[PDB]
Every structure is written in C-alpha cells, then in structure tokens.
Amino acid sequence: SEHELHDRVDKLLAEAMNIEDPEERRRVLEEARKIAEELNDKSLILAVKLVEKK
Amino acid sequence: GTGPEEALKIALELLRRGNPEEARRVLEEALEEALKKGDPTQIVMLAVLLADILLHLGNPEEARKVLEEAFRVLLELGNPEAISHIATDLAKVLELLGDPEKAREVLRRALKVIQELGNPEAEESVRERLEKLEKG
C-alpha cells in the first residue's frame, strides 16, 4: 500500500510539473503533500517539496 | 519541442490509457536529453516515473538501470533534495530486485554526499530510509 501511495505522489508531482494554471498546480501539489504527510514518510514529503520549489 | 515537462504529461496520459510501452519510450527519449541538459528536478521526475513504469511492466532490471544512471548524474549537481528522491527510489527498486546490500550502499552514498552539501531535511530523509530497510 505504501509503494502504491508513493506511486500516486510521484504521478501527481509529474503532473504538476507541466500545469499552467497556478491554482490548479497548487491543488495538485496539495494532493501530493496530503498523501506524503499522511504516510509521514520524510523522503516522500521531501519529494513534494523539491517540486513545490520549482 | 517536447521538453521534460511535456514528456511527463504525455507519458502520464498514455500510461493511464493503457499504453505503458509508449509512455516508456516517450520518457526514455526525454530522459536521454535531460541527463545531459536538464536540471535536477527534471531529471528526477522523468527518471522516477520512467523507472516505475518499467517496474510494473515487469522490467525491474531496466528500472534499476534508469535510476542508477540518473543517480550518478544527480550526485554531481549539488541538489541534495534531488539526490534524496532518486536514491530512495533506486534503493527501493534494489530491494524489490532482491539486492538489499546494494540498496544500503546507494543510500549510504547518497547520505554522504548530502552531508557534504549541507541539508538536514535531505539527510533526515535518507537516514529514515536506511532505518525502514527491514522490509522485503
């Protein structure tokens, strides 16, 4: 289940990388952050933060 | 032209629409260029998506090759956050391949470079991965 959840985050982060509407982009990144912090997995949280910064 | 971001978007759609092999080839081509000319975030997300698609296609050794190639490049690009993600996904694929010893080596090498770069969040991230290795 954890690997499936990691995959879900990675796909949301890949999606956010090309989203043009800034508010749509925030929402998708928030979906990713939500999963990562619910898992309390520091590496997945940091994966979201890397893309948030870009 | 189809930059890394455009290739990610196309691949996500093709994967979801039942075309994983075509998603794979779209990312393989983009990653080839990003490894020479792309920034660390572009490299990371192309590589972790491509590798996971290969994993679930049943090609885990190809997934490892993709992550290992990206890992070697990202170790020199000065971004500890990018190193954390690529090493985490590489170590997990090595575990799934039945090679936990190389998973440890990957994480220990990532931690050493991250410590040299100076980023406590990236270092706590890789340390936690080293702890959570007791899985299969």
Ligand SMILES: [Zn+2]
């Ligand atoms: Zn997966």
Ligand SMILES: [Zn+2]
């Ligand atoms: Zn990942």
